[model samples]
Target: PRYLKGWLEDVVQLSLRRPSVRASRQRPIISLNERILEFNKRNITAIIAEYKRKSPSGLDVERDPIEYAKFMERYAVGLKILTEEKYFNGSYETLRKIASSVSIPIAMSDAIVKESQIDDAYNLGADTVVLIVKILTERELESLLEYARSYGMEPLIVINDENDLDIALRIGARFIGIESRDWETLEINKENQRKLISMIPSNVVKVAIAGISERNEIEELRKLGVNAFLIGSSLMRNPEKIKELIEGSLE
Candidate 1:
């Protein structure tokens, strides 16, 4: 709220107004790319485990912050906590609890559209928030990301198409995401994950999301130029799998 306009928190001047939630600050501030780069530099697995209570696919999502903290301690480049209420059944309270306990970065994972959502994310202890490219026009994309950065909340721009990639490039966002599943078709396409990654320029960090279920997928994605993995369903269903992948070695 104290930030000057264009200082990063531009556009949507007035907060959209949402639930009251505030997270304590973190240290050694860095961009999403830099954060992931730190992991890659050390030969650590760059895994972004997501916390989801449930999905449209009828999985019984558990709201367990302990499981989340454990993942951060044992394995994970970063963590993503879902905030979408209707489908994912996520709450800021859940995030506040985890944020208080963990030190690693977190993405306030949601189908974010409004400036208000970004404010709520910042208020709730998220280090970053997703600005899906497929949903936002160029103006809105620029506007929201600018607003997020000013508040010190890095923007993770999610995209699924070449145009979306171009849009992300134009917006000057550092974190770009590509998910294999189409929201409409629900079909898993590794080829899309493969092809889309090739189009993204090398400077920006490319994140692979959705349909990432096994270590082989991770191995394959690493080959496809993925900087990190935003894995939700796989980790949510088998939290232990992370240990398997991390300790099993990438052979």
Candidate 2:
């Protein structure tokens, strides 16, 4: 079911009022307003732009890296450079330069397999990093999250399904990116995605990616607790498409 407008408003109000609903003994009580401002200042909830070369599903995702960086500055919310050579075309040096060149917030979107990988990303000038809940155990995830927090790097976790919600919450992660397509098969699972989104905490900033190109899909996800949408192919094919979609969705 689509969440009503009042539902979101109420959730935001409740989050503001409590400010410690998800606090843990081990975690410190950071100000929610400060977090929101930091996220907004970095443009975390708007676009999560991606640079891709190819996909495992036979999609030729190639784009001029430099041109794409420029387009990202012009259109999307922020740049997320996918450094997985097997599935995408991106590089750490290129992404670092882009982030340094432009004022847009940039994240290293690689397959971060180890704690050292997170440090590597930060050393390469990444303002944010990606963590896959399915890839790490609870303890490992927590340790890595703490390390990221210590270094002032925001950890954005990609949830493939609803089962990841508990871990995401346990880590106190605010930025949640949901992939509508299966990781291995790349199959679009809209129903499963929508159902999982309904279970997400309203205080968390939700961003929907993977197979979210259609306007109707964006609207549906927006109603299903998504605060942001990341459109790669659609926006890459036509940069103006992102602004158009945002205009409709934000209204």
Candidate 3:
């Protein structure tokens, strides 16, 4: 109860920070939804390869930011850097380094509950920021979304259920990530992608995030009207597979 209460208290306080960002801290003018739609138009899978250093299940490590960025850019349309320091060993410096080195849009991935976190993502070279619906109150969600928009970047909200999806849609979110892993149990299922996409309109930029491990998931989800996918683990673990996908699509 203490942890939950403290977390909510922190979220409320962070959400109420003054809505101001210094010009010097602002990053590139990037629109993740537009970028995703462009790749979708050409039938090219919009890949946001993540630079993960650690996971709750003990996934960890890293490579040179520039080298990794250059390598992944050949295949992915964008990059997502996990900035959750406690669980993922993510850092703002890591994002800034990779973002500066890569031409592709950067999605600053974190369990964001604070308003300044959104601003930090933008000021640190991120083109987009990830907002998980299960973490914040509905009002916090709206506040973060608007704050991200103020910096000329888009917010990529993660949804795992109907209520999450409904709240995102109610607030006029154009892009959303349907997570495949259950937050409480961390159980992963590919079917979450299929089912969640089923409820989303074809007009929305539905991206399947988390638990995607194979290209088959991409092919199959695309068939179900998912316009893009936010793959992190598979891409990082088996980079050659990504190389293969990009080359195969070239022909």
Candidate 4:
């Protein structure tokens, strides 16, 4: 599909011209996995609330990214900042601001294909990076996984199917996002996500991504062994629902 190929190519082209960010003073790196584990142990839903302004799905949020992040920080286990400028209406400055202001672990969510981009993410205060399997070759995925680890950021490799999962396993990925929506098409299909969740090994941290809202949904996925969820639009639309979700998911 053009949506799958075209968007990645466009983002990679922009990456070639994006200036390298200079290193900033180091902020304490938070462990994303630990945060999720803490919530899991307490029998609460581990929600990685996202700072996405807009997306291909026509959803939009009108709030300061940093302020939005702070609101989520009160309840979420971690934060994911959508830094993809073209489709997601996000920027590195947004990520930089939120990462600096908030204490929660921040994920620089973008279609990353270059090592320099990873450097930029780290300098901008990202504790983790998002690497989508659909956009990368096997070697590229492997290299990026190693590169992210060298900086102490466990990259979350987003997987859509068996082949993607194979590459993630081959590259020794510890964090895997079982994506429910197609990145390019923005289609939601939890049926496929449920099927994929059953395939992930117990050792791997399974983070469910996209089209997730409501406590019942999280409860169901948790039963399928999903360790956490990366929720965006729904929370962006109704930020206060985090309270409901957290309380509702509590055992």
Top candidate, metric lDDT? 4
What global local distance difference test value does model 2 have?
Answer: 0.64
Clashes of each: 3, 1, 1, 0
**Candidate 3 vs 4: which has more TM-score:** 4
User: For model 2, how does the per-residue alpha-carbon lDDT over 1-251 read when each residue is reduced to its tens digit?
Assistant: 11224433333233223211121112232322234345555744456566666555446755567777877676556677776544464556676566556656666776565566666666666667877676556776678778877877767777877667777887787877777876645678877777778888888877776777656776666667677666676666666667655556454
Query: Residue 194: error of model 2 in Å?
Result: 1.1
lDDT string for model 1 (121-240, tens) is 766667788876765668888998999988876688887777778888888977788978765446678787789899877777888988776777777777777889887877787787
The TM-score measured for candidate 2 stands at 0.76
TM-score-best of 1 and 3? 3
Cα TM-score of candidate 3: 0.87
Ranking by TM-score: 4, 3, 1, 2
TM-score of candidate 1 versus the correct structure, residues matched by position: 0.85
Candidate 1: list runs displaced more than 4 Å: 1-31, 249-251
Residue 41 of model 4 has an lDDT of 90
Q: After superposition, how far is residue 53 of candidate 3 from its true place, in Å?
A: 0.4
Between candidates 1 and 3, which one is better according to lDDT?
Answer: 3
Ranking by lDDT: 4, 3, 1, 2
User: What clash pairs does model 3 have?
Assistant: 25-123
Candidate 4 residue pairs that clash: none
Prediction 4 global C-alpha lDDT: 0.84
> What is candidate 4's TM-score against the reference?
0.93
